[PDB]
DNA sequence: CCATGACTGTAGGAAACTCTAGA
DNA sequence: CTCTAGAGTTTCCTACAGTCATG
């Protein structure tokens, strides 16, 4: 789309510009937005006056103002103004948002695990993340890839029905090669969709690898 | 205090420092502006006519949809992180308006050497703060009291808006033997060095000869 | 408890787009 | 008037410091 992209953190105010508009009223411009809150298309005016005045209100200078963002606010936003006269200008905005979960935690982590077979190593958990994002395992600071050599991950995403946010869980199990590193290091790393931010790592776990009793 | 500036009609958002981004929070915005009878304290829920002027956002930031001369003042936010954590934000606020382009009026088509002439009156409209007016001859600016060079200047504030109108009337005694096709201009040098100066179109009267 | 490290948060600077002035 | 050019304004990226967690 002619739409330019905008991304904002959840809870913070956003302010959009109406291209080529009178800086002081009286002004003629009308915003159009289809989003989570809009049933289909909501048209907003310099006067405002609906229930939207505590949500989205056109400023005296023509820009569109949102006191604090929320997930439902994701969508497209457009404006049409008249530069007198009769010059006329457009705006096309795609708006996405995000939230950052707390530092991921580990749970159900093996005191010690044994070689030659699968083991339940533990589970990472991240809460309050948007958009969803992901959990990646690292052995000694290197990546752990599924389907390959006894490495497995039991995964889910749980959306808080109220906050519309995500609770994350990743359970790792591994079959160690007999005769491997006896004190290997695992970590877990949450990453979001864009470079909207960096990566969060869990405090590692340095379990003890015990060998199988001979037969 | 952190110095701040913005255009009249523009929105303004002040970030409360060290305070929870989501409500509820414990914080206090107390300020003194041209809209205040004294120090004024606006709360999380705020209230009064102030909601139409400056309002507190769910994330703790104070906000003005349209700032005006009436709003130049002091803004302090004493906030509580959780307990009893405390950090205090401090701002100093100057504002401005860019006036209409400068104009010379009553400018001379002809003028005579050896005595004074009315060159013209450079006139600016709709400025805040008021600022200064200067003249220049063929690229270089001029000074009063030097070799028969004088100025009648004034400033006036439109009552409704509060902006300013400056008049500058230029007068000189031309040297006999100088430039018969001289070019003069006026320039508005704003109070706050926000933008570069604005200069009138030139005027190239013809120096004529007495006896 | 003290020293150390890591993080959140904020301060300053640089680059990009938009508007204004001029030909 | 359509086009060219120089600032102005806003924005993102980068960096230093304060603050919280940790050994």
Swiss-Prot record, chain B:
It comes from the Eukaryota. One of its GO terms (cellular component) is plasma membrane. It is a single-pass type I membrane protein. Disulfide bonds join 16-77, 122-186. Induction: Induced in T cells by antigen stimulation and by the S100B ligand. Induced in trophoblasts by DNA damage. It is found in: Cell membrane; Cell projection, Phagocytic cup; Early endosome; Nucleus. Phosphorylated on its cytoplasmic domain by PKCzeta/PRKCZ upon ligand binding. Phosphorylated by ATM following DNA damage. Endothelial cells. Increased expression in pre-term labor and preeclampsia placentas compared to controls. Residues 102-199 form the Ig-like C2-type domain. Residues 1-211 are extracellular. Keywords: Cell membrane, Cell projection, Disulfide bond, DNA damage, DNA repair, DNA replication, DNA-binding, Endosome, Glycoprotein, Immunoglobulin domain, Inflammatory response, Membrane, Nucleus, Phagocytosis, Phosphoprotein, Receptor, Repeat, RNA-binding, Secreted, Signal, Transmembrane, Transmembrane helix, Ubl conjugation. GO terms for molecular function: advanced glycation end-product receptor activity; amyloid-beta binding; DNA binding; histone binding; identical protein binding; laminin receptor activity; molecular adaptor activity; protein-containing complex binding. One of its GO terms (biological process) is positive regulation of heterotypic cell-cell adhesion. Residues 1-94 form the Ig-like V-type domain. Glycans are attached at residues 3, 59. Constitutive homodimer; disulfide-linked. Forms homooligomers. Interacts with S100A1 and APP. Interacts with S100B, S100A12 and S100A14. Interacts with TIRAP. Interacts with HMGB1. Interacts with LGP2; this interaction plays an important role in AGER-mediated pro-inflammatory responses and cytokine release. Interacts with double-strand break repair protein MRE11 which is a core component of the MRN complex. The interaction enhances MRE11 endonuclease activity and promotes DNA repair. Cell surface pattern recognition receptor that senses endogenous stress signals with a broad ligand repertoire including advanced glycation end products, S100 proteins, high-mobility group box 1 protein/HMGB1, amyloid beta/APP oligomers, nucleic acids, histones, phospholipids and glycosaminoglycans. Advanced glycosylation end products are nonenzymatically glycosylated proteins which accumulate in vascular tissue in aging and at an accelerated rate in diabetes. This is Advanced glycosylation end product-specific receptor. It comes from Homo sapiens (Human). The chain holds residues 23 to 233 of 404 of the full protein.
């Amino acid at each position: 789309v002619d739409a330019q992209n905008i991304t904002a953190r959840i809870g913070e105010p956003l302010v959009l510009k109406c291209k080529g508009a009178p800086k002081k009223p009286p002004q003629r411009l009308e915003w159009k937005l289809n989003t989570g809150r809009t049933e289909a298309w909501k048209v907003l005016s310099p006067q405002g006056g609906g229930p939207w005045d505590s949500v989205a209100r056109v400023l005296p200078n023509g820009s569109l103002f949102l006191p604090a963002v929320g997930i439902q606010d994701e969508g497209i936003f457009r404006c049409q103004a008249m530069n007198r006269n009769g010059k006329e200008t457009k705006s096309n905005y795609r708006v996405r948002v995000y939230q950052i979960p707390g530092k991921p935690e580990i749970v159900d982590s093996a005191s010690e695990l044994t070689a030659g077979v699968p083991n339940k190593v533990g589970t990472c958990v991240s809460e309050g993340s948007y958009p969803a994002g992901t959990l990646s395992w690292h052995l000694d600071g290197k990546p752990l890839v599924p389907n390959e050599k006894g490495v497995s991950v039991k995964e889910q995403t749980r959306r808080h029905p109220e906050t519309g946010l995500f609770t994350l869980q990743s359970e790792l199990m591994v079959t160690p090669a007999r005769g491997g590193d006896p004190r290997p290091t695992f970590s877990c790393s949450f990453s979001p969709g864009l470079p909207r931010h960096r990566a969060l790592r869990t405090a590692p776990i340095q379990p003890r690898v015990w060998e199988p009793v001979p037969l």
